[PDB]
Ligand code: HEC
């Protein structure tokens with residue numbers, strides 16, 4: 678019942694893809710008409726996934742593509758697992774702050790907290806995700 | 809606006825990531841129970857279940873898009889109101905699971921976990937090609 682390396686890659690990819698979809702809804706609400714309840718729901722996804730323990734999905738054998746299952750994790754990620762962990766914690770904390778800002782229903786607060794989350798996604802990607 | 813292929817990929821991602829978190833709750837219920845692990849996993853299930861995934865069932869997502877295959881049954885698209893009702897049953901079961909987990913109510917967590925799983929199953933039985 679332990680996830681295989683292939684399953685760990687697919688599962689982490691699923692979490693990132695689903696965060697990204699919800700981030701996009703927050704961006705859309707900030708740029709246009711603001712639907713506070715939609716932003717709450719989206720922010721809760723980002724907070725929950727960022728705090729779900731995704732480091733468990735970076736086990737041995739998950740550095741390589743597995744047949745048709747390709748990873749964008751760079752070798753640098755597996756060489757620096759402690760720094761990756763720190764960047765993940767920065768996302769967890771920022772994402773919780775985004776969900777708390779969204780709970781207030783105030784677009785301005787969300788705008789700030791959303792910037793801090795996006796910066797945390799980008800900080801990790803710049804170092805550890807292939808383009 | 810997401811393309812059809814992106815809607816398929818995104819809904820698949822949501823279900824896959826829920827499933828991983830469901831398995832963590834099951835492991836806590838069958839093994840050494842950790843309330844904080846259960847909170848984190850329950851929060852994912854509740855959040856994903858309430859994230860507006862019906863928006864991922866747009867036109868053109870009833871068929872495979874090149875290499876991107878869907879396992880949704882064609883009947884799903886003939887019954888979208890019911891699909892939404894079943895999604896809503898998941899959302900209210902999952903919020904109950906997360907509320908119980910948040911407050912440390914382990915009996916209610918155990919029972920809500922079974923109701924969540926039943927909601928997954930109810931939709932699959934009708935609407936997933938398996
Ligand atoms: C601490 C590191 C880290 C953080 C933080 C992080 N990512 Fe990533 N991201 C990755 C890695 C590594 C991959 C490649 C995963 C793979 O292919 O195995 C990835 C891949 C992705 C992908 C590629 C498609 C996919 O589904 O895999 C998207 C989209 C994505 N991330 C979005 C996000 C968003 C949005 C956030 C912030 C809300 C985020 N990521 C935060 C490390 C991170």
Ligand code: HEC
Pocket residue numbers: 816819820821823824826827830853877878879880881884891892894895898924925927928929931932935936
């Ligand atoms: C209201 C309908 C509905 C509910 C509720 C639902 N599912 Fe599904 N599920 C589907 C459909 C439809 C697919 C196929 C998606 C596709 O391939 O486009 C699917 C696919 C999946 C997949 C495969 C995703 C992949 O990787 O392709 C898993 C795993 C899954 N569901 C688990 C769950 C779990 C766990 C729950 C409950 C916590 C759940 N589902 C609730 C409709 C639902």
Ligand SMILES: [Cl-]
Pocket residue numbers: none
């Ligand atoms: Cl009716």
